[PDB]
Amino acid sequence: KVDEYGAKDYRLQMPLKDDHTSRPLWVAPDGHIFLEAFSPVYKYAQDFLVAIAEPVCRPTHVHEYKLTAYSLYAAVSVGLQTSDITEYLRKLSKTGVPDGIMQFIKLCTVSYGKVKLVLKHNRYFVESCHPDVIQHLLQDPVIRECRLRNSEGEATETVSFEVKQEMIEELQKRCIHLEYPLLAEYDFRNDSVNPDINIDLKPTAVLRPYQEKSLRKMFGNGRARSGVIVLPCGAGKSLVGVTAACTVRKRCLVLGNSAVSVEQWKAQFKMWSTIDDSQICRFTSDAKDKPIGCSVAISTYSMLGHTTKRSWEAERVMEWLKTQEWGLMILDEVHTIPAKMFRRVLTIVQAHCKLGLTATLVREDDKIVDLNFLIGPKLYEANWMELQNNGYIAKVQCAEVWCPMSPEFYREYVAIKTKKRILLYTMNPNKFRACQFLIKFHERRNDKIIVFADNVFALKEYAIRLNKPYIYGPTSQGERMQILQNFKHNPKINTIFISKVGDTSFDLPEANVLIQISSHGGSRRQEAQRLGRVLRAKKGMVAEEYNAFFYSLVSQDTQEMAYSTKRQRFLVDQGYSFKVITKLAGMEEEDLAFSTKEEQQQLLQKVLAATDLD
Amino acid sequence: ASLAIKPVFERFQSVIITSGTLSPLDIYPKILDFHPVTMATFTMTLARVCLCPMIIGRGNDQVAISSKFETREDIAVIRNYGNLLLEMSAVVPDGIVAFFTSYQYMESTV
């Protein structure tokens, strides 16, 4: 029922009881859950909600969580039944639990844990304790095609049956249609085909309480379960992956975006794991290692997904990987997995336990529903604000600086209606002056400055005029490393211009000032992950609530305003504040470029000279 | 060693043994191969707590602190000990004494 104001009239379906203050939860019949942080039982309520409910928004006071079938399956896999969950919900809900949600929970939980998929002898078997369900699912035409059949076309005969590897991902989606999702259960201790590996945990590795909780939730009843864990950048996600690999003790596969990710993972493994270097191999296009005796293999998705003809040695390595059975597989940056080529890598690679790690999961193409079965349900997601309070990460000071558009640019901005319009607002002389003043202020404050600009031309022009190093497409790796080392070590240079390649193509050195000038066009998750990766915790300013500085230069009255508003929605859902700054104090006293309007006319001439080709 | 003390037990009227480090009361009769008449430990009663024994098995970086010869050569343990000593000097009064496990380990740590 909907009121005239648009509010959903849930009063009738929610019988309120007199235990208002003690119970902190509101359970609307639509599936949403509201929690008050100031309640004394917030910690218990937070722990209960995280286990069973997927959070939507976590601002300072009231948090909103959502109930999903995948979340219910994850809760069942943890070991919680319907009765205890219902009891805890009723003990915490201010109003009575609607029967619609109750029936929703009853239907999902009963159907969970019925169908099991086993990978043995490089063969996939579907088996269950209820042959009636198996017999019923045989009638499905999609399941008939996915089921492996004999060389003569005859179908193969807790009875299990072989399933085609190429149709595994198809079967995963069909399970949703049949309402019988598969079970990602692995024999953590009962495994015998794959021997253990001489790899342990160094004493220098310390697991933070949330990391330990996430690992223990993943290891349901002592058995590793496939899933996805979301952690903020810089929170030792690589350390968590190394710890999980050491715990598994089986064959380990790790996939990164580029060779830099492979090198970072190898360094972390050497830093925390006890596996010998001879058992660590890099299947990269430049630095190659023999796959013989490769206990842990680190590679990239595109290397395994190279549809074009590969090198002869790479073909041999791929054959060995296909022949080899992998107890554990590790995937980094899950948000790029929904791509079809990278999804095909999952079919190509035969692995028992698959764990995915990333910082964000809100794809702009919303291709995450299928991702819930490509790997599994989201195992854990840490609260950014809570970790900021714990001091594990820097408490970032975020600000959006509005740079007025010059009237000459503004008229041309309105005149242009095609994609060439990006250059006009990305090259605002007023924005240039604001960026120059910010750089001067932070250099006088002795701060590390990273200027991110997606547009190659704008980034190059800004870096050249400001006389700072610039990083763009080619960026020869030797020169890139030299620039990174100069930024890390040389105090004279503390301002680095980085193009779009700064997201995942290489490692971002720890800094404190990050200024974003150019936008992708609405990448609400990509730039958020970039911001998380750029800024890390800095000692000395732990007591202050503003130890990391992020500024977003946005052109007023332009489409960049809408892009920024759409993008910052994800960070606002995390409780991150954003202050709008229209006037910058100190620009009047400081001397900046383009002080005269004729200089801005020259910049306009230069920008117009850069046609739509750039 | 009990032989060296064997005649003393069998010749003199009584032998008085006392020490401040006598945590096990039964090993010494076994060590000296005799049966003392009285084996009593006097508990210390203090109106003011004059001792604050503390155990620090974790360093600043949460490194597991150990003195096993496998971990004696660890640089992390040495650095944690150095940081602890620096903080103790900056905090605790002038009197500071640090007892190591062996001379070579102490020299390497220094």
Nearest CA in chain A to B80: A204
Residues of B near A (Cβ–Cβ under 8 Å) read 61-64, 66, 71, 74, 76
Chain A: give the shortest CA distance to residue B60, in Å. 11
Q: How far apart are CA A539 and CA A394, in angstroms?
A: 9
CB pairs under 8 A between A and B: 12
Asked if residue A568 lies in contact with residue A578, where contact means CB atoms within 8 angstroms, the answer is yes
List the resolution, Å.
7.1
Size of chain A, expressed as the number of residues it contains: 614
Three-class SS state of A398 = strand
Residue numbering of the annotated binding site of A for ATP: 231-238, 533, 536
Q: How far apart are CA A316 and CA A11, in angstroms?
A: 66
Q: How far apart are CA A550 and CA A447, in angstroms?
A: 12
A193 touches chain B (CB under 8 A): no
Q: How far apart are CA A33 and CA A55, in angstroms?
A: 9
Q: What is the 8-class DSSP label of residue A418? A: S
Q: What are phi and psi of A253, to 5 degrees?
A: -125, 130
Three-class SS state of A402 = strand
Q: How far apart are CA A314 and CA A587, in angstroms?
A: 57
CB-count exposure of residue A592 (10 Å: 0-12, 13-18, 19+): middle
Q: How far apart are CA A71 and CA A80, in angstroms?
A: 12
What is B46-80 written as a DSSP string? -SS---------B-TT--B----HHHHT-HHHHHH
How many other C-beta atoms can be found within 10 angstroms of the C-beta atom of residue A258?
Answer: 17
Which method was it determined by? Answer: cryo-EM
Three-class SS state of A552 = strand
- The four Cα atoms A424, A430, A431, A432 give a dihedral, to 10 degrees, of 100
Q: By 3-state DSSP, what share of chain B in percent is helix, strand and coil, each rounded to 5?
A: 40, 0, 60
Q: Which long-range contacts (CB under 8 A, 24 or more apart) does A339-346 make?
A: A341/A301, A341/A302, A341/A305, A341/A307, A342/A301, A342/A302, A342/A305, A343/A169, A343/A374, A344/A305, A345/A255, A345/A301, A345/A304, A345/A305, A346/A169, A346/A374
Break sites following residues in chain B (C–N > 2.5 A): none
Contacts of B63 in chain A (CB under 8 A): 203-204, 206
A203 touches chain B (CB under 8 A): yes
Nearest CA in chain A to B66: A203
Contacts of A204 in chain B (CB under 8 A): 61, 63, 76
Closest partner residue to A206 among B62, B71, B74, by Cβ? B62
Q: How far apart are CA A40 and CA A68, in angstroms?
A: 27
Size of chain B, expressed as the number of residues it contains: 110
Beta bridge partners of residue A433, listed in sequence order: none
A209 touches chain B (CB under 8 A): no
Contacts of B62 in chain A (CB under 8 A): 206
Q: What are phi and psi of A382, to 5 degrees?
A: -80, 150
A204 touches chain B (CB under 8 A): yes
